[PDB]
Design an enzyme around this catalytic site. Sequence first.
Site, PDB file in Angstrom:
ATOM      1  N   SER A  88      42.036  29.476  51.347  1.00  0.00           N
ATOM      2  CA  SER A  88      43.046  29.559  50.279  1.00  0.00           C
ATOM      3  C   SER A  88      44.466  29.736  50.836  1.00  0.00           C
ATOM      4  CB  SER A  88      42.711  30.673  49.283  1.00  0.00           C
ATOM      5  OG  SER A  88      43.393  30.450  48.062  1.00  0.00           O
ATOM      6  N   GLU A 118      36.043  24.478  42.860  1.00  0.00           N
ATOM      7  CA  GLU A 118      37.288  25.151  43.218  1.00  0.00           C
ATOM      8  C   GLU A 118      37.961  25.881  42.052  1.00  0.00           C
ATOM      9  OE1 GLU A 118      38.799  25.800  46.028  1.00  0.00           O
ATOM     10  OE2 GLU A 118      37.583  24.689  47.479  1.00  0.00           O
ATOM     11  N   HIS A 161      35.681  29.109  44.191  1.00  0.00           N
ATOM     12  CA  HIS A 161      36.672  29.332  45.246  1.00  0.00           C
ATOM     13  C   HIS A 161      36.340  30.608  46.032  1.00  0.00           C
ATOM     14  CE1 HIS A 161      40.605  28.699  47.061  1.00  0.00           C
ATOM     15  NE2 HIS A 161      41.004  29.915  46.727  1.00  0.00           N
TER      16      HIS A 161
HETATM   17  C1  A36 Z   1      38.020  34.316  45.293  1.00  0.00           C
HETATM   18  C2  A36 Z   1      38.792  34.523  46.588  1.00  0.00           C
HETATM   19  N1  A36 Z   1      40.237  34.851  46.293  1.00  0.00           N
HETATM   20  C3  A36 Z   1      41.088  34.565  47.494  1.00  0.00           C
HETATM   21  C4  A36 Z   1      40.722  35.466  48.670  1.00  0.00           C
HETATM   22  C5  A36 Z   1      40.408  36.245  45.756  1.00  0.00           C
HETATM   23  C6  A36 Z   1      40.969  36.156  44.327  1.00  0.00           C
HETATM   24  N2  A36 Z   1      42.348  35.622  44.225  1.00  0.00           N
HETATM   25  S1  A36 Z   1      42.525  34.095  43.552  1.00  0.00           S
HETATM   26  O1  A36 Z   1      43.891  33.743  43.703  1.00  0.00           O
HETATM   27  O2  A36 Z   1      41.512  33.307  44.164  1.00  0.00           O
HETATM   28  C7  A36 Z   1      42.161  34.171  41.806  1.00  0.00           C
HETATM   29  C8  A36 Z   1      43.060  35.127  41.044  1.00  0.00           C
HETATM   30  C9  A36 Z   1      44.380  34.773  40.645  1.00  0.00           C
HETATM   31  C10 A36 Z   1      45.196  35.677  39.953  1.00  0.00           C
HETATM   32  C11 A36 Z   1      44.676  36.943  39.660  1.00  0.00           C
HETATM   33  F1  A36 Z   1      45.457  37.859  38.973  1.00  0.00           F
HETATM   34  C12 A36 Z   1      43.387  37.327  40.028  1.00  0.00           C
HETATM   35  C13 A36 Z   1      42.593  36.412  40.713  1.00  0.00           C
END
Ligand code: A36
Lengths: 533, 538
Positions: free
Chosen positions: A200, A325, A438
Amino acid sequence: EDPQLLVRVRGGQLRGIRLKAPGGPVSAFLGIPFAEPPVGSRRFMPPEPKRPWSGVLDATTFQNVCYQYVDTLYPGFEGTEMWNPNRELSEDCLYLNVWTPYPRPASPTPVLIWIYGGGFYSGAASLDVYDGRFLAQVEGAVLVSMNYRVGTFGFLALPGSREAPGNVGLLDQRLALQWVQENIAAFGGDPMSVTLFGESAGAASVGMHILSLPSRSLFHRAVLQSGTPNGPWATVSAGEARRRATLLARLVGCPNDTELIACLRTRPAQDLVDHEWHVLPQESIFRFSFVPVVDGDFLSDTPEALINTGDFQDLQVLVGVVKDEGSYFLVYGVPGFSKDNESLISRAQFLAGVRIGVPQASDLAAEAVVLHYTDWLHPEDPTHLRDAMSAVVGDHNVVCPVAQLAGRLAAQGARVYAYIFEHRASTLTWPLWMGVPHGYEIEFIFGLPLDPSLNYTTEERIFAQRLMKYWTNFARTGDPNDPRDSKSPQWPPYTTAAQQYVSLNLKPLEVRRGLRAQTCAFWNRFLPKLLSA
Amino acid sequence: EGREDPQLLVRVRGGQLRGIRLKAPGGPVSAFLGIPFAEPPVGSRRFMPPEPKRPWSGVLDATTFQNVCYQYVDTLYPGFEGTEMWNPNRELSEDCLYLNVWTPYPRPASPTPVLIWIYGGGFYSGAASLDVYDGRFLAQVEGAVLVSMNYRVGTFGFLALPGSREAPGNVGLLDQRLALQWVQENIAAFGGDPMSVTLFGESAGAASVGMHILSLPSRSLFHRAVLQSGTPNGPWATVSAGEARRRATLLARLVGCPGGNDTELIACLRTRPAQDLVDHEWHVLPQESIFRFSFVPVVDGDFLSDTPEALINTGDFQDLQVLVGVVKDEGSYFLVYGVPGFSKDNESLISRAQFLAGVRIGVPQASDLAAEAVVLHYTDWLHPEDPTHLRDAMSAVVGDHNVVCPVAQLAGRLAAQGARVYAYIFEHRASTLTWPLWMGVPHGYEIEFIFGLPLDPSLNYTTEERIFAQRLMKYWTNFARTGDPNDPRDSKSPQWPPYTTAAQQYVSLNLKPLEVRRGLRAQTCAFWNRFLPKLLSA
Ligand SMILES: CCN(CC)CCNS(=O)(=O)Cc1ccc(F)cc1
Ligand SMILES: CCN(CC)CCNS(=O)(=O)Cc1ccc(F)cc1
Ligand SMILES: *[C@@H]1O[C@H](CO)[C@@H](O)[C@H](O)[C@H]1NC(C)=O
Ligand SMILES: *[C@H]1O[C@H](CO)[C@@H](O)[C@H](O)[C@H]1NC(C)=O
Ligand SMILES: *[C@H]1O[C@H](CO)[C@@H](O)[C@H](O)[C@H]1NC(C)=O
């Protein structure tokens, strides 16, 4: 005193700790400082090299997590908590971790450097899914992970200002890379063989090290899992960063760039995080407030301009995506979606989610999206509408940026290998409809199934071992193929002509052609012509 | 009379007719050919609505086909069957408003459902006398009464100065309607049932059938309708009043012309030899194009009260039964008449560059952005430079834009508005086809099968093509008789289900039994029918 656990680096002496992996012991050195704590007046500033220390520094525990937002959507739920900080939060967080085999390598050993993701707003090297012991114990690798500043602390920028020039979180990473160059040999690492890998935002960071000349002398190969420096979410213009920073300041009562940044420096950390999400220009998902900025310095131009014109010979890169994703992001803002039901939606809700999933789209472009993704055989079937909403998000933000990057790299001299990860973990706590979300390849790459207490299946273990092989063989050589397995099929390079990539799942490698070819032509070629006129 | 066949003598409103005893392979049929249904639209009647034929004295000989309406004659491939079979087979004349009638021999006891054929040819060409329109097989084998009429084409049929008295436009369609009234009044004297009248037609004839459905005064003249490879909606079948005016004014200039303005202009046009008008017909098209025709029905607020698009969207079609369909390769025929790179004499393997140029020609009304969208949609992104794919994609752009997607739009609009719809795709390529393989099953090549030409042994079709032709004749006639192509006794045979919005079912027409398919090129037609208009509307 175990002499295996004792290392001298340019800054002084360290004591590591001997850890148990199912296959045997590993040496871990956790919490090593690579920078002066970016606190007080160092907030928003480029990091400085860690001053030398006296005696033996204890490096047997994980250090603090960079100050960041903590998720609250599903309190106590494992699928979300697993990404939440597992140590205390602090602005004093510039520390890195090193795993090596026990006893330490007799010969200089290839180095994997992990850069965590988390939208540039969150993340930590201490999470269980980033446990380096398996790769070190099984593949005999030296594995390094660092913390870097996220959110306002890493990426708040008043472009052109001396005291918030932007991209300092990326400079945090870059300093860790120099540290590895200068010190890794003491641990048994080969500084002339350094492979970056990340997921990511981590993948996007790896991408920006490829695109930023001064980083190029600090690594030799790169892996970008589910993320790209190009794309809609990973960078902002100087104008937009300045807008968001100026807005956040107004929101916290602040108040020359100097004076605005000064008042911000007086603000308690959580006071900044409290308003972090409030500076996004549209209601959106897969959008982050403080990310890398096109500064004309770390990023000489936009990532798009740089990939379109760069020269990538003598570069080998491994890129890919997971099957689903977009599914993760929908529960975080799109009406109709929840992890607690099948999230079957109406046509109207799919229309509304597209404005949120593609927040920058004109009415017409959003119309084009809806029309493309609708199954006109079944235009109103909720199960399709649900799966398509997920697809729109995944393809727009990851899959098509990945295909765009893969394409430009291969065409401009780079050696590229592409995958799609299609296995869903037996232990996965998210609902079935989200498929392979994801982030859920990571536990396999890092070898977590080899831990019996984690209750993975025998096949999932055999599978994880295969992935650790591809990744480390790629680190060693720039080619993920085992030089001993004399079996067809092999993993072929992605090219512009054949566009071959492989699927990673429980079944043997399968070679496919064209990565969402038609649908990405829509995103990569047509939409940009549209939103203009 | 006295010493002639008593079965060939018939009286109609205008007088007495002597027909002819024709041989079909399975027996004799009665033909009445060249029956006049209007006064000759010549002299001061050129461009005018037709006047009904004034009664004649004595017995009119109706044993030969009459003149073909004055028209452009194709010169692309001289002496080549694939082209010549569509060309005029009788003398060209403005005096051409005649119709033909085939009936069983002897003529039927009970009243027999009637089929009325309206030929196509882009509204610039065609004739009811062509070999592939021979009604003798349907008459002999199915016992049908078949009527085909000549109607004015080109300038003579469709040149309009909208709003004027001397060229109101659409007179070619008024010729058709007058033939339809003729059938209502006279067909009973042949054993035809004026209460069971089914229209069918291909290409522009198809579109004509569509316009009769949409025009109120036509609606009482028929009961069911078949549209083969054509629609009254779509990009080629109509023009606005403004565009018809512009084209008529331009054509006048090109021939030397020049009550007030309009009256004098049209009066001058009537002094022109018919060939002078034909010789300049193609020169009035706004862009370099294929599948565009200079003089077509005009949206006049009369025959057509609004655009066909508007009429089908907002119409009540309860208790209307329609059969519609397309051939597998609608576009191929058209490529050799304009798109560089294409010929019948080679494989027409084209470059990407030639494709892009071809799209501008096949979608002549597209902006650069719209053109781009088409190219992006039809490109194979795994093989964007493969000449074979680009060849076939060019053919598909033209076929989808002009026929397949208008048909899909029509079918779905009709089915949702109460009509009973039956839809097909015709996928069999005739063993006798003289066009190259690359053209597949081209526009117009289902017709010879519908009409039963494979029953003529001298034509060298296969045995399976004979059986196939017979199936199709049954489908069409069963539909004419009942409003349902299925044989009510033959449940064993697979069934042809109606087309619905929910299920979107249609059938494949080939040498094999019926296969039901869902989705009338659904994704690609969502592009043309839903997205593309939104673009050009910005
Ligand atoms: C799953 C893996 N991931 C990346 C490491 C962790 C989650 N972060 S995320 O950006 O993928 C989704 C997200 C976006 C905004 C928010 F407020 C909360 C979650
Ligand atoms: C094959 C069936 N068809 C309809 C009956 C024959 C008429 N030709 S056409 O209008 O289809 C294509 C054409 C266009 C422009 C031109 F100059 C010559 C031909
Ligand atoms: C086929 O013939 C036409 C006309 O002679 C020409 O334009 C085209 O280039 C030819 N194509 C091939 C594949 O030879
Ligand atoms: C679960 O899905 C339903 C509709 O299927 C939706 O209304 C709701 O917001 C979702 N979650 C909950 C329990 O709020
Ligand atoms: C087919 O039948 C024979 C085959 O040679 C030939 O003499 C005849 O002319 C052919 N018929 C047509 C219509 O080409």
